[PDB]
Amino acid sequence: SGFRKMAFPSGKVEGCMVQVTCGTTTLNGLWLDDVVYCPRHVICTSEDMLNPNYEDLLIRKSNHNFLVQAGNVQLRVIGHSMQNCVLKLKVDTANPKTPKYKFVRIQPGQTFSVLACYNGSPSGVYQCAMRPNFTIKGSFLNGSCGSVGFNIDYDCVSFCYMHHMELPTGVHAGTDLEGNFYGPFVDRQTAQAAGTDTTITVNVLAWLYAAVINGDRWFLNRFTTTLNDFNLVAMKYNYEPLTQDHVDILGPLSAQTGIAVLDMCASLKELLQNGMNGRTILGSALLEDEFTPFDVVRQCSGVTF
Amino acid sequence: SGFRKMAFPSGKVEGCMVQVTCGTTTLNGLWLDDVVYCPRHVICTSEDMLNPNYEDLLIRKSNHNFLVQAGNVQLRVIGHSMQNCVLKLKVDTANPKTPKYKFVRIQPGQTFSVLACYNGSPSGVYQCAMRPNFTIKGSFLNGSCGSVGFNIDYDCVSFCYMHHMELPTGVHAGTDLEGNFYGPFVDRQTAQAAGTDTTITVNVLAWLYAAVINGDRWFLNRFTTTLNDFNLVAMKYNYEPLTQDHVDILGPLSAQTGIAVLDMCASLKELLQNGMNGRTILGSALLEDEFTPFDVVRQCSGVTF
Ligand SMILES: *CC(=O)N(c1ccc(-c2ccns2)cc1)[C@@H](C(=O)NC1CCC(F)(F)CC1)c1cnccn1
Ligand SMILES: *CC(=O)N(c1ccc(-c2ccns2)cc1)[C@@H](C(=O)NC1CCC(F)(F)CC1)c1cnccn1
């Protein structure tokens, strides 16, 4: 029993974290085989940030200008290139702790674990959702850039995020491991605000299913609804449209609890219209939307890696 | 910026997790040097549970009856003994991934990371507080027993908890790594309910300081209070007494924000008496008490390991 915001075991990612320094600036790198991936703004100074010419700046850097450290051991850089907003530093030593891995670009609404690092040393692990507005609500201080987000399926680590910058609203923007930003954000000190966010409706439904499984059932009403009628209410409360794909992905939770998805939609509709009246669901006083249907399944079936 | 419920990197603990099987029952073991620590109820069957005679049951077990697996590799047991509610299985191979470690008994109100495991394989990491009633609100399914709780200071892993059982209220009970239970709980299927819990006042104050640091300042009132007057209000709302020790441990957060501890107490007093009026603090609609003053400091200073 019990439901908790749960991260993946970070051990396989800990073994890939290195420190990258180019002159003044130091941040985190991801070491897989004989390549170190890091944000390209490592080559920017405190005076380049408004609109840095990354091509020009990189040209003036040698392999020897890049100080890469795996603990107290320096890795010799023998090649460097830029792919979008990330640098790829070729080193003469392959990471002996290189796990089975993939580079994926996740969808908005999907969740991943972040290993927060400073100077190539991991500080903590936490679970994030890619927001519909293509930001993440993380915990990142100065020198956190190059920290990665990931999912694990048995033995394979799927890297989906590398941290680049914070927006003035204190939310976070980054790239896939091909260095393409999530959302319209750019790696420079410019005027860029996140679009208005929305609640991940399918995730709220998943979390309500988690509540029932854990015996927190107070909110279940005697009603049903059409998908169309639910989505008209959802729209009013800034919830994203629930699609048949969403209904289908909720099937295992519906099968386990015996509650039809449109019946759970009816209970959610009432919670949105009437509020929670000072009550809690799984120890929360508001509706939680950063648990995917698979997150709920994993935590309620005990899938290991 | 940002504040998140953050676990320690689990890598050092992942390398210590093994599977222990004695006949019918399989659970998790902690492998340090040439000793495997696990709950003693591994030697109980489904018919022994009401009041198992652990001494009698253990006597009838051989070294060879204990099947210990580190992945797919069997560890040969060459000795076994019982210390309180844990077994110590001596194996012929020392764990090559044995980190620098200690066994501590934590105080109520203190926090630690849990590495949830099944069949010696880690599923997830999450942050817990030892409740004043000596339970933890974790996420544990069948076969989770032997999963450990820990803190990390630079290189040293301090093991403070091993999971044993769930209470009918869905809260969790376990032991230190000397096998002494936290609280009055026993490893058998008996009538044992957790005493009434209380809110960890010093932790709520720490979390309010975290909010101010992150720029969530709406709740700060223009008032102060005596420690004595605060504790009379706190008592009414089932908050534990705030001691001078608690005030002293909050000093760094008071120094950083410029808010005197008794001034923060005045703002907390108003929140308790008037509620939050539908508003949130660090994205929560109720007052959070599972962040220690040091947890807030670590996450707001970026301490690595
Ligand atoms: C890398 C890092 O941790 N941070 C950072 C992001 C972006 C840049 C850029 C340089 C060129 N284009 S954008 C540099 C550094 C920090 C961060 O924003 N730190 C600032 C501190 C003040 C300053 F020095 F003036 C400018 C950098 C970061 C990232 N994520 C969260 C919080 N801080
Ligand atoms: C080890 C484990 O995961 N669990 C467990 C706890 C305690 C015992 C005891 C045996 C003798 N004294 S107490 C055995 C197993 C489970 C758990 O309680 N599983 C039960 C399932 C039904 C049953 F088989 F009839 C009896 C065991 C556990 C632990 N923590 C959370 C959830 N489940």
- Is B279 in contact with B218 (CB distance < 8 Å)? yes
C-alpha to C-alpha distance for A115 and A119, rounded to whole angstroms: 13
C-alpha to C-alpha distance for A225 and A212, rounded to whole angstroms: 19
- Is B276 in contact with B125 (CB distance < 8 Å)? no
Between CA A12 and CA A83, with CA A129 as vertex, the angle to 5 degrees is: 65
B256 CB neighbours in chain A (<8 A) are none
Q: CA nearest B183: which of B125, B115, B130?
A: B130
A1-14+100-197: CATH architecture: Beta Barrel (2.40)
User: Which ligand is nearest the CA of B41, by number?
Assistant: 2
Experimental method: X-ray
| Annotated domain spans of chain A | 1-14+100-197, 15-99, 198-301
Distances (CA, A) of B88 to A79, A234, B84: 51, 55, 10
Q: Is A167 in the pocket of ligand 1 (CB under 6 A)?
A: no
- Is A128 in contact with A59 (CB distance < 8 Å)? no
Q: Which residues of B192-218 are buried (b: 16+ CB within 10 A; e: fewer)?
A: eebeebbbbbbbbbbbbbbbbbbebee
Between CA B25 and CA B30, with CA B26 as vertex, the angle to 5 degrees is: 135
DSSP letters for B150-174: EEEETTEEEEEEEEEEE-TTS-EEE
C-alpha to C-alpha distance for A228 and A241, rounded to whole angstroms: 9
**Which tokens go with A202?**
């399918």
CATH no. for A15-99: 2.40.10.10
**Which tokens go with A230?**
């639910």
Ligand 1 centroid distance, CA of B84 (Å): 52
Amino acid making up residue B75: L
- Is A202 in contact with A177 (CB distance < 8 Å)? no
Q: CA nearest A38: which of A79, A83, A98?
A: A83
Whether B298 and A123 lie within 8 Å, measured CB to CB? yes
Q: Which atom of ligand 1 is nearest to the CA of A48?
A: 11
Whether A118 and B304 lie within 8 Å, measured CB to CB? yes
User: A 206-265 residues with CB below 8 A of B?
Assistant: 214-215
Q: Can you tell me which residue has the tokens 């320690």?
A: B8
The experimental resolution of this structure, in angstroms, equals 1.8
- Is A253 in contact with A206 (CB distance < 8 Å)? yes
C-alpha to C-alpha distance for B264 and B284, rounded to whole angstroms: 18
- Is A241 in contact with A201 (CB distance < 8 Å)? yes
Q: What fold, for A198-301? A: main proteinase (3clpro) structure, domain 3 (1.10.1840)
Please enumerate, as own/partner, the contacts of B68-75 that have beta carbons within 8 Å and a separation of 24 or more: B68/B18, B68/B19, B68/B20, B68/B21, B68/B29, B68/B31, B68/B36, B69/B18, B69/B19, B69/B21, B69/B120, B70/B18, B70/B31, B70/B95, B70/B120, B71/B120, B75/B18, B75/B31, B75/B36
Same topology for domains B1-14+100-197 and B15-99, yes or no?
A: yes
- Is B264 in contact with B256 (CB distance < 8 Å)? no
- Is A175 in contact with A130 (CB distance < 8 Å)? no
3-state secondary structure of B95: coil
3-state secondary structure of A36: strand
Q: Do strands B101-103 and B156-166 pair parallel, antiparallel, or not at all (unpaired)? A: parallel
Q: CA nearest A177: which of A196, A151, A203, A202?
A: A151
**Which tokens go with B99?**
């980190």
Does the annotation mark B164 as catalytic? no
DSSP letters for A86-150: EEEEEESS--TT--SEEE--PPTT-EEEEEEEETTEEEEEEEEE--TTS-B-----TT-TT-EEE
In sequence order, which residues have a C-beta less than 8 Å from that of residue A87 and are 6 or more positions away? A20, A36, A37, A38, A39, A40, A42, A43, A58, A80, A81
- Is B68 in contact with B75 (CB distance < 8 Å)? yes
**Which tokens go with A211?**
């509540």
